[PDB]
Write a protein that binds this ligand. Structure first.
Ligand SMILES: *[C@@H]1O[C@H](CO)[C@@H](O[C@@H]2O[C@H](CO)[C@@H](O[C@H]3O[C@H](CO)[C@@H](O)[C@H](O[C@H]4O[C@H](CO)[C@@H](O)[C@H](O)[C@@H]4O)[C@@H]3O)[C@H](O)[C@H]2NC(C)=O)[C@H](O)[C@H]1NC(C)=O
Ligand SMILES: *[C@@H]1O[C@H](CO)[C@@H](O[C@@H]2O[C@H](CO)[C@@H](O[C@H]3O[C@H](CO)[C@@H](O)[C@H](O[C@H]4O[C@H](CO)[C@@H](O)[C@H](O)[C@@H]4O)[C@@H]3O)[C@H](O)[C@H]2NC(C)=O)[C@H](O)[C@H]1NC(C)=O
Ligand SMILES: *[C@@H]1O[C@H](CO)[C@@H](O)[C@H](O)[C@H]1NC(C)=O
Ligand SMILES: *[C@@H]1O[C@H](CO)[C@@H](O)[C@H](O)[C@H]1NC(C)=O
Ligand SMILES: *[C@@H]1O[C@H](CO)[C@@H](O)[C@H](O)[C@H]1NC(C)=O
Ligand SMILES: *[C@@H]1O[C@H](CO)[C@@H](O)[C@H](O)[C@H]1NC(C)=O
Lengths: 48, 46, 46
């Protein structure tokens, strides 16, 4: 529960240090950048 | 405009907010416009 | 010119094609030239 709760509320920050909150759509936008897809591709398709 | 990039319009992005985005080229042309203005001003005088 | 960077010329790259590259600064100065032109035209009038 702690690992899963930290993931959805803080992304990878809680592993690197103190758990810094971040909106999940904002977090998923950082993840899209991680795979080489521009973050606007998330926001423009967030519902899908 | 250098820190950011543009895609689409405001209707699609859930949670978008309103704030000005600085175009650094604008004042670099505005002072150019004022330089142009004063050149014209002086040119009327003689 | 913002989407692309430049290196060398058209003789070395195998498979290079011909296509225009938009420079967004050009029209931003072109309408500045038209603004300038009408200023001069109006200055001839009086
Ligand atoms: C970010 O900026 C956007 C653009 O500035 C804002 O969109 C604008 O939102 C306003 C308010 O909703 C809207 O105003 C008109 O909305 C109706 C047309 O869509 C029109 O009928 C309205 O006129 C009526 O209402 C006013 C009072 O609200 C009365 O005084 C009038 O007499 C009349 O009864 C009003 O004129 C703009 O049209 C709209 N512009 C665009 C381009 O969408 C965003 O709201 C803003 N977002 C945030 C979070 O600040
Ligand atoms: C991408 O664009 C490049 C530049 O726009 C093109 O390069 C140009 O290609 C043309 C045609 O191949 C070439 O034209 C002249 O080529 C000779 C000098 O190199 C010259 O002798 C030619 O004149 C003779 O030939 C013509 C018919 O070809 C006759 O009508 C004439 O009367 C005369 O006999 C011709 O004027 C350019 O020199 C060349 N420019 C450069 C900078 O290389 C690319 O071909 C083009 N590539 C693609 C895939 O579109
Ligand atoms: C955040 O949630 C509140 C409700 O708790 C809502 O009123 C608000 O519009 C939301 N803002 C964004 C950007 O999603
Ligand atoms: C204004 O015009 C005069 C010529 O009458 C010139 O000597 C002077 O340098 C000009 N100044 C400016 C700011 O254009
Ligand atoms: C690609 O192959 C075609 C024939 O299959 C050939 O005509 C063409 O020059 C080739 N282009 C490149 C860039 O190798
Ligand atoms: C042109 O000059 C007149 C004065 O003769 C002025 O009233 C008008 O605003 C000027 N227009 C422009 C576009 O410069």
């Amino acid at each position: 529960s702690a690992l899963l709760a930290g993931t959805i509320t803080s992304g990878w920050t809680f592993g690197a240090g103190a758990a810094l909150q971040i909106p999940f759509a904002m977090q998923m936008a950082y993840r899209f950048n991680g795979i080489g897809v521009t973050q606007n591709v998330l926001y423009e398709n967030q519902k899908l | 405009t250098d820190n950011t990039f543009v895609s689409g319009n405001c209707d699609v992005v859930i949670g978008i907010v309103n704030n000005t985005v600085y175009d650094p080229l604008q004042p670099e042309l505005d002072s150019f416009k004022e330089e142009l203005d004063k050149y014209f001003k002086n040119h009327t005088s003689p």
